[PDB]
Amino acid sequence: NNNTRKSIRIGPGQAFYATGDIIGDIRQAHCNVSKATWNETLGKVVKQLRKHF
Amino acid sequence: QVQLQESGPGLVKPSETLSVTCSVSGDSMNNYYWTWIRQSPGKGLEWIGYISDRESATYNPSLNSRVVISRDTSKNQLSLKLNSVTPADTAVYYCATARRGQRIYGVVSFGEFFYYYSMDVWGKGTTVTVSSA
Amino acid sequence: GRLFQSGAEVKRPGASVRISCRADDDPYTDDDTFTKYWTHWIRQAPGQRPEWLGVISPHFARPIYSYKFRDRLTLTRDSSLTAVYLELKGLQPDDSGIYFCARDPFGDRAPHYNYHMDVWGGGTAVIVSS
Amino acid sequence: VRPLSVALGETARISCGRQALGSRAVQWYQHRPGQAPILLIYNNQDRPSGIPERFSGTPDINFGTRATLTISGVEAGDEADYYCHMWDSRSGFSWSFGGATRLTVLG
Amino acid sequence: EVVLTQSPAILSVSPGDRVILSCRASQGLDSSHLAWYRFKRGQIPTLVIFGTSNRARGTPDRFSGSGSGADFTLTISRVEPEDFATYYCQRYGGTPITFGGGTTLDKK
């Protein structure tokens, strides 16, 4: 989301920071991981984990 | 190719139903959504509703839900009837077919798209007058 | 970081232009630039080297003017102490150019006393035509 | 209804009356009186086959652009009602075709 | 009045060469009082070198400066494609602050 910040004067010298408009689409925040890289790292973790169990 | 030709009486007394039908020639109901658009004098076009092969009747909320849109592949033709017609409902009635597109702006597994309808093949329209005179 | 100037101006000959310079576009900021640094005002006409107009002090907004601009330039700080202003009166077609504000310790900061316009801002294009 | 008048051989530029809030998909319709409505532009820029390469829409690239239909070299026949069916991502289902723009060619 | 003269107004070079830019003063500078500035059209001006030899904060090690008296040089060790701009020297130590005319770099 393209966020707009808005300053509100709430007291003498005091500014509250609000969210104003979203500019463009409303979308969800998200994270991406490479699927093959994550699977290979999980295999390495599983192999180091089988030495204890 | 898709041909489509409307049909209707044109002479309807107020406070009853009005039926306009739409016969499609050239092929069957393969690809298409089917929609109805009326145009009254003194104002612009007006989308009134659309259906598809799943028979999901979706109407304009601006037209009171007095409307019934149906179709059949036995006769292979479309049909429209609205209930309790007032004399302000005189208009040219166009039968049209609609393609659905999806506009994708983000992640599709989050549902960040929408569907839109483009009416590509139209018809001439029936000039249906409603009056008791 | 950066300096935020007002928008480009088109003026008549004999009029006045007023340019702003802020270190923060937040109107209710507490940035305290312009109480720590000197702010230079520097124009560049097309086809010329940069020309220095004046500098305003952090100390109580005391201005030093160039002698060729002294009779028609005013350098002001906002009473909120978070913006500085240039006012050039009696405009002529050779006053057209890009105007910059620049920020400088100006030999006044207590460890090393250096001199550098280290943060420049933007540039307001000023056109004088009729 | 919004009238707009353009001389022959010039370029007419019909703006959409509605503004998009978000990514749009804009259909442009041409409606002569007594004739059937004709789809000129769909998906903000795409012409269906059978539409001349004088109609253009503005593509939805780098949000902030207004949707305009551009008619280059307006004929005597290119005068009708023009509808901008505007769909976007923050407005829901677009039941309205919008207000028309009656083009008049001058001469 | 101190006048600064920058000797070649246009200078042509290939990306990866060593370039000398020169500033000549009318008198005797303090050498805490000479700086260099990068001007390109459509971009924010940037301090390159202050105090005749000190690099700025966002300034790479390919730039250095030297000089004394009335002779000052800004040398670029390896020319990059973003170093193709006008470079100005300016002098502190009296008002009006004066700039130096400018040496523009274009590629071969």
Ligand SMILES: *[C@@H]1O[C@H](CO)[C@@H](O[C@@H]2O[C@H](CO)[C@@H](O[C@@H]3O[C@H](CO[C@H]4O[C@H](CO[C@H]5O[C@H](CO)[C@@H](O)[C@H](O)[C@@H]5O)[C@@H](O)[C@H](O[C@H]5O[C@H](CO)[C@@H](O)[C@H](O)[C@@H]5O)[C@@H]4O)[C@@H](O)[C@H](O[C@H]4O[C@H](CO)[C@@H](O)[C@H](O)[C@@H]4O[C@H]4O[C@H](CO)[C@@H](O)[C@H](O)[C@@H]4O[C@H]4O[C@H](CO)[C@@H](O)[C@H](O)[C@@H]4O)[C@@H]3O)[C@H](O)[C@H]2NC(C)=O)[C@H](O)[C@H]1NC(C)=O
């Ligand atoms: C984490 O990972 C996830 C992965 O899950 C990432 O998620 C991705 O997030 C991005 C957003 O950041 C999404 O991007 C949007 O994608 C859509 C969908 O694109 C697909 O569909 C397009 C249309 O398909 C049409 O044609 C095909 C036949 O080709 C047909 O099958 C279909 O039915 C339909 O008819 C394809 O064009 C597109 O192809 C892309 O990839 C091809 C191969 O990779 C490549 O060859 C292509 O060149 C193209 O790049 C793909 O299959 C895009 O439509 C959308 O882009 C439009 O929207 C944005 C925002 O509105 C706009 O700014 C863009 O400029 C672009 O707008 C153009 O298209 C509109 C519709 O087409 C049109 O209305 C506009 O006017 C504008 O049109 C201009 O360009 C087009 C061509 O570009 C031209 O024809 C016009 O005339 C005009 O010039 C977004 O990019 C991803 O969908 C999403 N991925 C998934 C899997 O969900 C996430 O980002 C990651 N996060 C992080 C932090 O990393």
Ligand SMILES: *[C@@H]1O[C@H](CO)[C@@H](O[C@@H]2O[C@H](CO)[C@@H](O[C@@H]3O[C@H](CO[C@H]4O[C@H](CO)[C@@H](O)[C@H](O[C@H]5O[C@H](CO)[C@@H](O)[C@H](O)[C@@H]5O)[C@@H]4O)[C@@H](O)[C@H](O[C@H]4O[C@H](CO)[C@@H](O)[C@H](O)[C@@H]4O)[C@@H]3O)[C@H](O)[C@H]2NC(C)=O)[C@H](O)[C@H]1NC(C)=O
């Ligand atoms: C008040 O403000 C004024 C105005 O700035 C100050 O006056 C200047 O002070 C600076 C102090 O750094 C002076 O610079 C020094 O100059 C001396 C003497 O220069 C002569 O001797 C040199 C031999 O060493 C010779 O090379 C010089 O020739 C160059 O300069 C002339 C111009 O003067 C030029 O025409 C030539 O072509 C040459 O380019 C010149 O004949 C010099 O000895 C100093 O060098 C030392 O320091 C530098 C850097 O620190 C170092 O690199 C050297 O190796 C050497 O160790 C230094 O350059 C400047 O000359 C003064 N200018 C004027 C106009 O007066 C004044 O000092 C201020 N007062 C106070 C109290 O602050």
Ligand SMILES: *[C@@H]1O[C@H](CO)[C@@H](O[C@@H]2O[C@H](CO)[C@@H](O[C@@H]3O[C@H](CO[C@H]4O[C@H](CO)[C@@H](O)[C@H](O)[C@@H]4O)[C@@H](O)[C@H](O)[C@@H]3O)[C@H](O)[C@H]2NC(C)=O)[C@H](O)[C@H]1NC(C)=O
């Ligand atoms: C998030 O939304 C922002 C809107 O609030 C987007 O900012 C816009 O970005 C474009 C280009 O990225 C800018 O277009 C430029 O405009 C200037 C002239 O504008 C000047 O004047 C306005 C007010 O008059 C001022 O607000 C600007 O800051 C400028 O000082 C041209 O010179 C450029 O060539 C270019 O056309 C928009 O001006 C800008 N709008 C605002 C309000 O800042 C931002 O791009 C969005 N971000 C993302 C990632 O989508």
Ligand SMILES: *[C@@H]1O[C@H](CO)[C@@H](O[C@@H]2O[C@H](CO)[C@@H](O[C@@H]3O[C@H](CO[C@H]4O[C@H](CO)[C@@H](O)[C@H](O)[C@@H]4O)[C@@H](O)[C@H](O)[C@@H]3O)[C@H](O)[C@H]2NC(C)=O)[C@H](O)[C@H]1NC(C)=O
């Ligand atoms: C806190 O409150 C203060 C008091 O209301 C605010 O200060 C005033 O803000 C207004 C609007 O920004 C300024 O008016 C502007 O003046 C400039 C030019 O200044 C000349 O004219 C004014 C009268 O307008 C005169 O008083 C001066 O001496 C100058 O001769 C114009 O270009 C503008 O169009 C606008 O009219 C006031 O000048 C300003 N100061 C005072 C003392 O009233 C202050 O902005 C508030 N702070 C915050 C952070 O919001």
Ligand SMILES: *[C@@H]1O[C@H](CO)[C@@H](O[C@@H]2O[C@H](CO)[C@@H](O)[C@H](O)[C@H]2NC(C)=O)[C@H](O)[C@H]1NC(C)=O
């Ligand atoms: C995370 O973002 C980085 C960019 O910071 C992506 O890395 C780039 O990937 C493309 C295509 O694979 C390469 O051409 C670039 O050279 C990569 N590096 C940079 C700096 O752009 C990476 O693909 C992203 N990862 C995920 C999982 O989305």
Ligand SMILES: *[C@@H]1O[C@H](CO)[C@@H](O)[C@H](O)[C@H]1NC(C)=O
């Ligand atoms: C991860 O790798 C293992 C072995 O390499 C494989 O059995 C498994 O299917 C992989 N999982 C995914 C999600 O790729």
